[PDB]
Structure 1
Amino acid sequence: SMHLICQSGDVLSARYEIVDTLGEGAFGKVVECIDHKAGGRHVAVKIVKNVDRYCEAARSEIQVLEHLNTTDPNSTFRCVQMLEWFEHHGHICIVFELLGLSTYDFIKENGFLPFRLDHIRKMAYQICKSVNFLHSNKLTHTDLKPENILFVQSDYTEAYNPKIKRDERTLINPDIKVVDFGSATYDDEHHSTLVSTRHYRAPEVILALGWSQPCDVWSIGCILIEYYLGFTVFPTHDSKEHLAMMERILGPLPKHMIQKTRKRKYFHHDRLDWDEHSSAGRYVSRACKPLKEFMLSQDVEHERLFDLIQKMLEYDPAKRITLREALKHPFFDLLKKS
């Protein structure tokens, strides 16, 4: 029972003393501990609910991390390092290096203000390089979202911004790592019918056309929008509504994808089965507009970012830019300047 076992001062595995709670998700909790058998190092321990599906995900996460961490022992590609795992009162507990705030929690604590463009550029490059390393190893993450991208160290400076009448926090160092490999799937493994957290889910996933590495690229494009704006451009908890928002932001779905899909519930003949005058229809009309209308500036660096996002949000997953190609996009040139 999760509440019974996650308390400050509790000691796990005769070595890890809980000092704080770092996060809680569907899966259980992540706590910060002092490791009394590694010289007092502070670590993060993910305590998994004793529930079938979360236990299975944790076991899978341990297998993937063992692979990724052995393949990349210097963490050149920025996947979180797993230190060990154990069981505590029947719960699986995974020990990680300690990181800073998730990118989501940073934005939340900053009043849902967005990141500045130079930080987005650096973060995007590192996200793309890390996930590309997964892709090179026959893996797809499937659950990329701001909560699963963590700052290495989230110290900030703070200043009033009169341009927007608000106190603003700015990272000192925006370096990141990628976490949460409990949904990561190898190319030759069973692919779950549904993947991703809704706001980051690709159209081939929604339409059950089959998914692979490209679905991670879509999620990354969605994450970059959220970093740029401070909010999602897909504010919905309904699949058909999500497709409608895609249409308004990105244009009509390709005919071949509507042709091929078994998800007939979404469609009336060859068009989305969508009433523009319903409550949901009025909201999508208010809340969505073409992608480039969300730009905050027409400066060329903003145009470069939006060009990349647009490529990442290509509907056809084969046509969609790969991460190897994304790393070569002009948006990143500023990082490669001598």
Structure 2
Amino acid sequence: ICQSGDVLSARYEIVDLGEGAFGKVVECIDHKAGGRHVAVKIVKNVDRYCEAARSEIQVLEHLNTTDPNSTFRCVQMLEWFEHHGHICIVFELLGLSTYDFIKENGFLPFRLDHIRKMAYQICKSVNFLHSNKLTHTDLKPENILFVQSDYTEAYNPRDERTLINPDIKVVDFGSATYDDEHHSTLVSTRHYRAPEVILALGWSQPCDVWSIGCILIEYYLGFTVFPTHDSKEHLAMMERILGPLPKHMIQKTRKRKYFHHDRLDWDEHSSAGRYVSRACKPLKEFMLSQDVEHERLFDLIQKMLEYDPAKRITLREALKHPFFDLLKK
């Protein structure tokens, strides 16, 4: 399936957007909504993804009927159907993901004024899930999309792309979990995974706040501050960047394998040791300016990466953070 010219459910004519673990997202003309263009997510016919897609449709029926005008900027689902035993989800058509924009921008960062608007809308959208006893669990730049990704290009003492409109929506509700629903041990894409998740101390709304903080650094720098595919390495990077893990979380965790007594079981002089030393350093040292508005973002990021998820700032508090004052003038 998934070639252009193909028609899905005698309605959606494929014209073009993105592969992934789940399957494919294609652009389609809706021949039965005045030729409106739509995005259609074709999901692998694989138990893990079938489950997740059935679950995403459930969550999207709720979010879309709770918020029919999309004030809280969750992507609108139009319809869903089966095509050769594949689940297909039809959504409003957005622009590039923030990940795909950054990449197409030569992995250059967003300017600060754009990060402020985007940060605000992310916190607003996700806080809305948090109000409805939902946790996203998988926030990341790939899953934040521009409503519209049109740009202007211009040189800079390196060629640069700036968004005309930085408005975003949030997508992928396939991992989203209700407060009372069963809570998987593994959640999030490693680089955006909260410490309560790695340590299997149980997680909720706060694991989204950690993810967002990670997203905000990535937008600021153009790269992740956790460039890793290993759990222990991840905890070690957190240490050099955020300070020691709390006493209590280390001694609660059944994830004892990561520990030698009460210290992280970490060789400084081994290959990965040397990597963490060189590539990681105290968070505030990644600042590109000492400007107040830079200091203000960084104060918010630091709160979002509070180790203890109880102490971790909530998105309700995050929206009243100073960094957003400029938006209220």
Q: CA deviation at 1:108?
A: 0.3
Instruction: Give the Å deviation of 1:199.
Output: 0.2
Per the TM alignment, residue 228 of structure 1 is displaced from its structure 2 partner at its CA by: 0.1
Q: Deviations over 1:228-267 (max 9, x none)?
A: 0000000000000000000000000000000100000100
C-alpha deviations, 1:298-317, integer Å up to 9, x for none? Answer: 00000000000000000000
In the TM superposition, residue 87 of structure 1 has moved relative to its aligned partner by 0.2
Q: Distance in 1 between matches of 2:173 and 2:275?
A: 34
SS at match of 1:114: coil
Q: Deviations over 1:151-183 (max 9, x none)?
A: 000000000012xxx000000000000000000
Q: How far off its partner does 1:14 sit?
A: 0.1
CA distance in 1, matches of 2:252, 2:218: 30
1:48, CA displacement in angstroms?
0.2
Question: For residues 55-75 of structure 1, what are the alpha-carbon distances to aligned partners after superposition, in whole Å with 9 as ceiling and x for unaligned?
Answer: 000000000000000000000
Gaps of 5+ in 2: none
Q: Tell me how far apart the structure 1 counterparts of residues 165 and 87 of structure 2 sit (CA, whole Å).
A: 32
TM-score relative to the length of structure 1: 0.97
In structure 2, distance between residues paired with 1:153 and 1:251: 39
User: Cα offset for 1:50?
Assistant: 0.4
Deviation at 1:319, TM superposition (A): 0.2
Alpha-carbon separation, structure 2, partners of 1:172 and 1:278: 46
How far apart in 2 are the matches of 1:308 and 1:300? 12
What SS does the corresponding residue of 1:169 show, helix, strand or coil? Answer: strand
Alpha-carbon offset, residue 11 of structure 1: 0.2
Q: How far did residue 289 of structure 1 move?
A: 0.2
Gaps of 5+ in 1: none
Which residue number in structure 1 is paired with residue 185 of structure 2?
Answer: 193
- Whole-angstrom CA distance in 1 between matches of 2:65 and 2:268: 52
Pairwise CA distance, 1:210: 0.4
After TM superposition, give the deviation of residue 211 of structure 1 in Å: 0.2
User: Helix, strand or coil for the counterpart of 1:276?
Assistant: coil
Shift of 1:127: 0.1
Q: 2:31 aligns with which of 33, 36, 58?
A: 36
Runs of at least 4 residues of structure 1 off by over 4 A?
none
Give the deviation of 1:293 after TM superposition: 0.2
Q: Give 3-state SS (helix, strand or coil) of 1:24's partner.
A: coil
Deviation readout 1:25-53 (Å, 9 max, x if unpaired): 10000000000000000000000000000
The match for 1:8 among 1, 4, 7 is: 4
The corresponding residue for 1:222 is 214
Identical aligned residues as a percent: 100
Q: Work out the CA distance in 1 between the residues paired with 2:251 and 2:86.
A: 46
CA deviations over 1:171-210 (Å, ceiling 9, x no partner): 0000000000000000000000110000000000000000
- In structure 2, the partner of 1:176 is 168
Separation (CA, whole Å) in 1 of partners of 2:240 and 2:59:
38
Alpha-carbon distance between aligned partners in 1 of 2:180 and 2:71, rounded to the nearest angstrom: 26
Give distance in 1, aligned partners of 2:225 and 2:91. Answer: 32
